[PDB]
Amino acid sequence: FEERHLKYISQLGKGNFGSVELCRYDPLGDNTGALVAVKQLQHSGPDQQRDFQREIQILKALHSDFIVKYRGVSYGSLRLVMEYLPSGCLRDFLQRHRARLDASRLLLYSSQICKGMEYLGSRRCVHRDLAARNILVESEAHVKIADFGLAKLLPLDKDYYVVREPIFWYAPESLSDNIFSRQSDVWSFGVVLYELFTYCDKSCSPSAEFLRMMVPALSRLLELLEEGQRLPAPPACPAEVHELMKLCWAPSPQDRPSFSALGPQLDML
Numbered sequence: 001f002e003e004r005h006l007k008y009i010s011q012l013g014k015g016n017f018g019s020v021e022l023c024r025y026d027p028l029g030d031n032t033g034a035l036v037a038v039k040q041l042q043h044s045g046p047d048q049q050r051d052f053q054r055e056i057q058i059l060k061a062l063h064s065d066f067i068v069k070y071r072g073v074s075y076g077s078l079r080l081v082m083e084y085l086p087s088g089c090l091r092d093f094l095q096r097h098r099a100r101l102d103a104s105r106l107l108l109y110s111s112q113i114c115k116g117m118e119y120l121g122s123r124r125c126v127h128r129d130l131a132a133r134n135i136l137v138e139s140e141a142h143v144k145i146a147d148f149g150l151a152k153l154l155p156l157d158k159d160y161y162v163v164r165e166p167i168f169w170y171a172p173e174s175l176s177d178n179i180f181s182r183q184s185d186v187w188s189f190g191v192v193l194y195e196l197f198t199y200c201d202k203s204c205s206p207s208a209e210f211l212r213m214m215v216p217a218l219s220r221l222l223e224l225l226e227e228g229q230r231l232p233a234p235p236a237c238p239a240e241v242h243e244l245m246k247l248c249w250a251p252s253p254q255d256r257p258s259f260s261a262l263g264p265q266l267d268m269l
């Protein structure tokens with residue numbers, strides 16, 4: 001993509017180090033292009049540049065109807081071009097349209113994220129940042145997984161990555177030892193199920209609820225969880241959905257289900 005032809009339209013979100021923009025790719029120069037989401041880093045230390053170059057590679061190598069489709073890059077500051085999903089992130093989506101959405105639909109959105117994550121597993125990829133806010137809505141019927149800004153691939157003959165270089169979605173062994181894995185994303189998925197069936201309600205949000213249950217955070221959370229404390233059953237959440245969450249939140253990652261194992265259970269409800 002030629003920088004000069006990525007004609008700016010509007011800004012969609014603004015982060016700590018980097019922000020995303022809405023653009024139209026009009027190479028013919030006649031206001032008739034294709035609408036893409038473009039991502040840059042503004043003020044960013046070398047640590048954040050190395051990360052952005054992986055995202056571009058990881059995201060490029062993924063081909064799944066439940067992950068944001070990479071389109072290309074620009075100038076190489078390097079800009080990452082992706083498809084535009086105008087319904088915006090699921091967290092804010094479930095809030096707005098809470099009335100119209102029912103359990104059946106939340107199951108559907110679960111199924112799709114499950115399948116999505118599963119695919120990441122097959123690629124030996126750990127999202128490390130899986131939550132309702134990092135889901136996006138294509139349509140009422142379709143959601144895609146997003147922000148691979150903290151995604152890391154597994155070392156070629158290992159099931160886990162110890163990261164040296166967010167908190168309420170982590171697993172104990174990620175809180176305690178900064179160990180990350182497929183099996184840790186299953187934990188995180190347990191949390192997104194909570195988020196889904198609370199319609200991401202701010203009041204009983206994962207953040208609020210763990211704060212209401214308890215000196216710093218990481219260590220107070222790691223202790224709570226180690227002691228067996230988990231997030232509450234959401235108001236009207238069905239029994240099977242609540243059970244799948246508990247299984248997702250198992251202390252030992254080897255005992256947590258796989259997305260391969262999760263999918264069929266969610267789909268048969």
Ligand SMILES: *CCC(=O)Nc1cccc(-n2c(-c3nc(-c4cnn(C5CCN(C)CC5)c4)cnc3N)nc3ccccc32)c1
Binds near residue numbers: 020
């Ligand atoms: C709920 C959290 C949140 O705000 N997330 C978020 C904001 C901005 C950009 C991304 N993001 C994209 C991406 N975003 C959109 C998008 C964002 N907002 N909209 C709608 C605009 C119109 N209004 C009325 C409703 C909201 C659309 C569309 N397409 C994409 N690709 N992509 C990435 C990739 C990495 C990080 C963040 C991304 C998310």
